[PDB]
Design a protein around this nucleic acid. Structure first.
Ligand code: K
Ligand code: K
Ligand code: K
Ligand code: K
Ligand code: K
Ligand code: K
Ligand code: K
Ligand code: MG
Ligand code: MG
Ligand code: MG
Ligand code: MG
Ligand code: MG
Ligand code: MG
Ligand code: MG
Ligand code: MG
Ligand code: MG
Ligand code: MG
Ligand code: MG
Ligand code: MG
Ligand code: MG
Ligand code: MG
Ligand code: MG
Ligand code: MG
Ligand code: MG
Lengths: 101, 300, 75, 88, 131, 92, 31, 151, 59
RNA sequence: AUAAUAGUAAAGAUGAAAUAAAUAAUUAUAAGACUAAUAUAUGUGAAAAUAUUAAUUAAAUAUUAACUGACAUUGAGGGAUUAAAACUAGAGUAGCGAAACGGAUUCGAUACCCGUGUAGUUCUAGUAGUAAACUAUGAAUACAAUUAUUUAUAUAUAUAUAUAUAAAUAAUAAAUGAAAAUGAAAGUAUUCCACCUGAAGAGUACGUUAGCAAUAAUGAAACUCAAAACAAUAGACGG
């Protein structure tokens, strides 16, 4: 067979430097273990400094912090500060009461 | 005094670094200072750090973050492999060239205001170059600056009525120009980001000047041939070039006309074989990466 | 009521655009440039939305004692 | 100055009393009102000791009398009934 | 006090989707300006599908015209507006939230503040100085 | 009319509940596995069982406190095991 | 005091409550 | 103008409780002339097509297959009841249009029904099933449940 | 008095720029006491106390 | 719960059972109570309490500036508030559920489990002032060695971290302690209040006060005994 699963091969980006270890399975496993959604902050409005309570009439943004059934995600999952989690949950509950979410 | 000596000590010479020792993102340049110990000191676990490195370590190169921690260990990784990437680049003898034809950053050139005609582009870059700034510390750039700029109102309420009164009575299209120049002229004396942290040129990867020819017993070398590896068996998606792994760098390989038949045959194991490449040019991007362009020299 | 009828027509008109919040539309500086100009120029500013400097210079005989000064210089 | 503090407290007492008359079950704010009235008594008691002339002038202008200041006051249920705080 | 009304009007006629919304905004706006109030802005939000099928006055709805109305009035007038909205068969859902004016007199609608435009002056100055 | 006929597809799926899967005609047992994952990530089976019998508020509060402690305790345990493994790798 | 000791007070309270219920009943018939 | 009742899809509903399993097969009937009626608004038309009427065709419990008392709520009772349903759907020529499966609760018959439909017993019905969903009814507060049993 | 400051200050600035002297001005010379209608009389009708405070503070 | 619809013959319950055109499914209508995720009761509140949304009114934070000039602390008596249950009126009554009447279990079963389910649980206006009303730890002030983690304010810049000062929490030094342990107090000190003086009798009796009432507060003595209690230790035992 001339095919390998993507999970068993690492694609080295262009312009990056590499070591021989980057072709091993240890690199594959190490990349899975340390795979965190750290790029969310730059794409996370609520981790930017905006007040989540100003989005109570924008269900599309709020729908990014609820599960498929509408259950607000725990702070352990959203990664927000206590204040933003508190404000975001209020926004979602207000949005639900208005008839938008 | 002891404080003076400490400031000049070899440990002080290493700049503070808390960057992750285990980083799984894109690596474009070295992030940690390589520490080396001599064989005699390695035999005694001596590295010039606070504590002895565990005897299990057989490498003579490491990178560290903290001399000591609350866990009573040193935070270190026994690797020094970014030095071999630099030395392999030196062996390829390809000077780094500017794709924009800019002045050489390692020479003290006499520059002029040719690019200074964008005073309003960069004077406001100080407040507009805030891509990743706090929502309130960036807002402190609005009141703190406003007061500083508002303290020059009297100076600009007299200079403008003494050097360009016509514009004040005709149009503000030129007044705005006199404003951008005024602040810069009154800011060049100031020190706003007087130290620039941007990478300077190659960043230290190569100090080789373009122009020199490589003499060899078989005559002057006209094309540099370097062994490499093809990573993918299908060109980079959306790009007309494949990717190769040459000397610790990932390059874009351009083929003469066709792709060798070993590609289809090998498939996803194409990286298992070594091909010969020719390094066309090497460029440096602002992210601090090296843009190496190669050519898959095939036996013919 | 006259202003109300004009506003309703101008906002609920087919030509008018409505905030449907279906996509992250793309494009601060504008409002930051008006501030910078009103801080440096002050009374002698060209911004439509000026600061209290202009109203202060008026009641302090500055915008008038400078207009005459400039005109006298032109003479 | 104690006279100014008493006057400033008087304004808040008048406002808070109006609130209580419309929210007779708001015990949290009734407690706040009681404490504020007792605070005003305390400041005026000091004023009587410090500057008696100002003291008598101040209480006359505020509509109070010496008894209202010196006597122990708890704003209890009997007070609400003897002065018809809530009306009927 | 500054208030922000968000109303979900019924779209009875598919040919005139923005008809009851215009008639309703005029009714609400007239109440505000005839009782010492000021209407600061009227931001239409367009036809949107309701998150579920909703009911009102023995009728069912699956879509509504969304509109926002930022207005200044007294508390008594604000309650009168809310009472009229809760009774009008056209209105499916209505919410009035106070916008604090303690720190600044000119606040934009939450929709605009969410986009970084904190005051109506910032919105107007971006339509004159740059448009 | 046809306007109410050609706009029913989105409308039908616009009022989704989030507890539905489009079956993969090839592997139909993989779609039931996906649905089960939704149930567990929204705690549907747990909530249903917890709603069968009434629990006093004090008991509810006790159980919520203990569960949180065990969750946090496990996170602290894993952090210490990671340090152990890292320390072992470096020869400590 | 421990549960063991609390149980002695519990028994005394139960017997007092039992006696007062008994007395109440009598008053009802005798009334 | 004329009743034109037609089947659009079938709903296979399963209620899996602790003591029994109920399986209902239904048809989503659509009068294809509803839009041809007079005095019909765009809202009424869209509201009629968003909740189409349903007609029950097959109704089964575990007691219809002879399982009695405590055996009704077991895995084997559900597996056989699921088979009988998948058979009655083929014996009634109701395997022409797409089927939507709706599961309600998490008793012991929920995993038996799934096994009987992804296996040999449901190799004909599974080919028509287009959408699976869960319809477990939860309460946000709501009525007070009975007291905990002391056993 | 339906007359408003803005309107009155718009007549003292139009009459002073057009030459018209309707009796309204004489009345306006009594409503405000401004007998003389010049550009340096409207500036003294619209003076704000804040301006005086700003100079006392500098002293 | 009621009605409609097709569709049927069992359904429901339990350890297993049995007591009382259905169950299930899709619609429509009505009613009462409750408040899923977020969530940590984090935080807030004097305590009791407090987490679906909005509004009105009231109260609540930090720093700075100015001001008052010891105006403070504590607090007998007193006052106010005070879970659940309970009671007095008028409404409400879906679900739950003392009692009662039945079904089971058992040698018996005035129980644990099941059914029917009254008071009650709900709202309005009141009475009453009790809980393991608990941190089983009164309030205030001065002070003492560290670390970690959050939070807040401030400062800086080569702009995102760094440096400061407080608060909270966790683990500790010292100290204290019968020990378990406490840890900024259960430490070093000062001030004020409440309370205790062997067990049992007893928070009982009698009287008194208060309450529509249940009761609440106050609160003994005789007789009898040489006991009685706490922390910790080693065992034995544990369905
Ligand atoms: K708390
Ligand atoms: K003094
Ligand atoms: K005292
Ligand atoms: K007392
Ligand atoms: K009831
Ligand atoms: K407790
Ligand atoms: K005390
Ligand atoms: Mg006091
Ligand atoms: Mg004790
Ligand atoms: Mg069973
Ligand atoms: Mg029951
Ligand atoms: Mg039914
Ligand atoms: Mg909740
Ligand atoms: Mg707490
Ligand atoms: Mg006190
Ligand atoms: Mg009653
Ligand atoms: Mg019972
Ligand atoms: Mg009471
Ligand atoms: Mg008692
Ligand atoms: Mg007590
Ligand atoms: Mg309690
Ligand atoms: Mg105090
Ligand atoms: Mg008693
Ligand atoms: Mg013990």
């Amino acid at each position: 067979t001339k095919k390998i699963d993507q999970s068993l091969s690492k694609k080295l980006p262009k312009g990056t430097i590499y070591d021989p270890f980057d072709f091993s399975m240890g690199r594959i496993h190490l990349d899975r273990k340390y795979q965190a959604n750290k790029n969310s902050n730059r794409n996370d409005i609520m981790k930017s400094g905006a007040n989540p309570l100003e989005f109570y009439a924008r269900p599309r943004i709020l729908s990014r912090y609820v599960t498929s059934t509408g259950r607000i995600q725990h702070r352990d999952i959203t990664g927000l500060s206590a204040k933003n989690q508190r404000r975001l949950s209020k926004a979602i509950r207000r949005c639900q009461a208005i008839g938008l979410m | 005094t002891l404080a003076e000596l400490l400031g000049r000590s070899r440990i002080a010479q290493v700049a503070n670094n808390h960057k992750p020792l285990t980083y799984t993102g894109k690596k474009f340049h070295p992030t940690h200072q390589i520490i080396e110990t001599k064989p005699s000191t390695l035999y005694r676990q001596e590295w010039g750090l606070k504590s002895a490195i565990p005897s299990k370590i057989k490498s003579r190169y490491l990178v560290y973050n903290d001399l000591d921690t609350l866990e009573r260990i040193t935070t270190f990784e026994p690797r020094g492999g970014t030095q071999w990437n630099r030395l392999r680049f030196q062996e390829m003898g390809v000077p780094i060239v500017s794709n924009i034809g800019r002045q050489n950053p390692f020479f003290k050139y006499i520059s002029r205001p040719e690019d200074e005609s964008h005073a309003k582009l960069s004077l406001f870059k100080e407040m507009k170059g805030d891509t990743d700034i706090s929502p309130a510390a960036m807002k402190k750039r609005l009141k703190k600056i406003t007061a500083l700029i508002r303290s020059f109102q009297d100076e600009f309420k007299e200079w403008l009525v003494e050097n360009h009164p016509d514009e004040l009575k005709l149009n503000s299209n030129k007044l705005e120009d006199y404003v951008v120049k005024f602040l810069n002229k009154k800011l060049e004396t100031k020190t706003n980001k007087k130290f620039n942290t941007e990478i300077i040129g190659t960043g230290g990867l190569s100090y080789s000047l373009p122009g020199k020819l490589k003499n060899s017993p078989n005559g002057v070398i006209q094309r540099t041939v370097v062994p490499g590896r093809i990573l993918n068996v299908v060109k980079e998606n959306n790009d007309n070039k494949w990717l190769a792994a040459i000397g610790g760098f990932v390059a874009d390989v351009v083929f003469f006309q066709s792709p060798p038949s070993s590609f289809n045959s090998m498939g996803d194991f194409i990286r298992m074989k070594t091909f010969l490449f020719e390094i066309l040019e090497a460029s440096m991007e602002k992210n601090g990466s090296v843009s190496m362009h190669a050519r898959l020299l095939e036996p013919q | 009521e006259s202003q109300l009828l004009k506003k309703i027509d101008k906002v609920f008109n087919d030509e008018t655009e409505e905030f449907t919040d279906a996509y992250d539309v793309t494009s601060g500086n504008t409002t930051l440039q008006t501030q910078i100009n009103n801080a440096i120029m002050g009374s002698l500013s060209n911004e439509k939305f000026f600061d209290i400097s202009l109203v202060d210079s008026y009641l302090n005989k500055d915008l008038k004692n400078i207009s005459n000064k400039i005109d006298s210089k032109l003479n | 100055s104690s006279e100014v503090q008493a006057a400033c407290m008087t304004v808040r007492i008048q406002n808070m009393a109006n609130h209580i008359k419309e929210h007779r079950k708001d015990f949290a704010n009734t407690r706040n009102l009681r404490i504020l009235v007792q605070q005003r008594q305390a400041i005026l008691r000091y004023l009587k000791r410090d500057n008696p002339e100002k003291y008598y002038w101040t209480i006359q202008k505020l509509g109070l009398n010496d008894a209202a200041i010196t006597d122990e006051f708890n704003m209890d249920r009997r007070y609400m009934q003897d002065y018809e705080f809530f009306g009927d | 006090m500054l208030y922000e009304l968000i109303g979900l009007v019924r779209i009875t006629n598919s040919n005139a989707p923005k008809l009851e919304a215009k008639e309703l905004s005029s009714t609400i706006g007239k109440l505000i300006i005839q009782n010492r109030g000021v209407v600061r802005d009227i931001v239409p939000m367009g036809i949107r599908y309701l998150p579920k099928i909703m009911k009102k006055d023995q009728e069912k709805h699956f879509r509504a015209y969304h509109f926002l109305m930022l207005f200044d009035s007294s508390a008594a007038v604000q309650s009168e507006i809310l009472r009229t909205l809760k009774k009008d068969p056209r209105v499916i859902r209505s919410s009035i939230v106070k916008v604090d004016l303690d720190k600044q007199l000119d606040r934009a609608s939450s929709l605009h503040r969410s986009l970084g435009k904190k005051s109506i002056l910032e919105l107007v100055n971006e339509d004159y100085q740059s448009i | 009319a046809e306007i109410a006929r050609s706009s029913v597809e989105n409308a039908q799926m616009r009022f989704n509940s989030g507890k539905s899967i489009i079956v993969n005609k090839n592997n139909p047992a993989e779609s039931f596995k996906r649905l089960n994952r939704i149930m567990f990530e929204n705690n549907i089976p747990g909530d249903k069982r917890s709603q069968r019998f009434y629990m006093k508020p004090g008991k509810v509060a006790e159980l919520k406190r203990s569960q949180r402690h065990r969750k946090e305790f496990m996170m602290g345990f894993k952090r210490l095991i990671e340090i152990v493994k890292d320390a072992k790798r470096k020869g400590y | 005091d421990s549960v063991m000791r609390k149980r002695k007070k519990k028994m005394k309270k139960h017997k007092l409550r039992k006696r007062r219920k008994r007395e109440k009943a009598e008053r009802r018939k005798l009334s | 103008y004329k009743p034109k009742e037609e089947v659009v899809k079938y709903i296979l509903h399963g209620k899996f409780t602790k003591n029994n399993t109920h399986l209902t097969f239904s048809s989503v009937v659509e009068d294809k002339n509803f839009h041809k009626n007079k005095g019909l608004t765009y809202n009424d038309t869209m509201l009629y097509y968003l909740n189409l009427p349903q007609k029950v065709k097959i109704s089964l419990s575990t007691g219809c297959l002879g399982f009695r008392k405590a055996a009704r709520g077991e895995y084997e009772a559900a597996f056989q009841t699921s088979g009988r349903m998948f058979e009655l759907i083929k014996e009634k020529n109701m395997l022409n249009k797409d089927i939507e499966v709706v599961m309600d609760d998490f008793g012991k018959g929920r995993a038996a029904f799934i096994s009987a439909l992804v296996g040999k017993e449901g190799a004909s019905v599974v080919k028509k099933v287009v959408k699976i969903s869960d319809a477990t009814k939860l309460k946000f507060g709501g009525v007070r449940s009975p007291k905990m049993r002391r056993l | 008095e339906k007359t408003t400051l803005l309107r009155d200050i718009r007549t003292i600035q139009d009459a002073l720029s057009s030459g018209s002297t309707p009796k309204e001005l004489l009345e306006i010379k009594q409503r405000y006491g401004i007998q003389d209608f010049s550009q340096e009389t409207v500036r003294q009708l619209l003076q704000l106390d804040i301006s005086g405070l700003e100079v006392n503070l500098e002293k």
